[PDB]
Amino acid sequence: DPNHIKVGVIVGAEQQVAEVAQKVAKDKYGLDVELVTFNDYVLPNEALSKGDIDANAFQHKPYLDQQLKDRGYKLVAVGNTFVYPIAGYSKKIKSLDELQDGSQVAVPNDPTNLGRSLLLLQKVGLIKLKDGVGLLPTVLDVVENPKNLKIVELEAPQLPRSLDDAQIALAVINTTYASQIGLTPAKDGIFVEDKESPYVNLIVTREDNKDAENVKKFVQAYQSDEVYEAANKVFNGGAVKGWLE
């Protein structure tokens, strides 16, 4: 079907935003966009690589690059979407003043979002990392940890439910999944990453279909004021436009 494109997205608020892009694509081009929904960060790139979908819209470039290295995919970015500054959340404390020694702190376990989380924990002064780590520090790079915090690495989609675990005092959670239980950085975050970061999300395709006319249309539909306005609402200001104005 030459007027049909399948795009992989994550359930929750990101799916809602993608639905607006779907609408713009229909209204502006009469393009038939099908959203294929996922609730993890691994299967969407598998689906794309295998040709089960044409594009996906869920990852930032460090993540993409790591996926190319680790899985050997031939994928490429065809457009920016939003930066989603990541936040630390808790259902046990309201401030770092209350963080007890020995507390478990949950973070994503994939290399780039793990690194990102550790950099955030360093930024707010809870830990110090070795020099030269760049974007990919690991827990082995922690050189100061005065509260003797225990970093608990979890699959990203598990981070929202981790908040209810009896020992998890703090969790760094992608807004993707935080939004599934109605949390946003501005409303619920104890601390939040700077808007300026390398983590703008992407629309990604295979090398072989990066220039497909339907891909170009979808990118233009997503990169629209209508989509921004929707994102800014549902993410309560936690979505920064990543494309050229």
Ligand code: MET
């Ligand atoms: C799969 S990389 C992480 C993407 C997620 N939406 C974020 O920007 O935190």
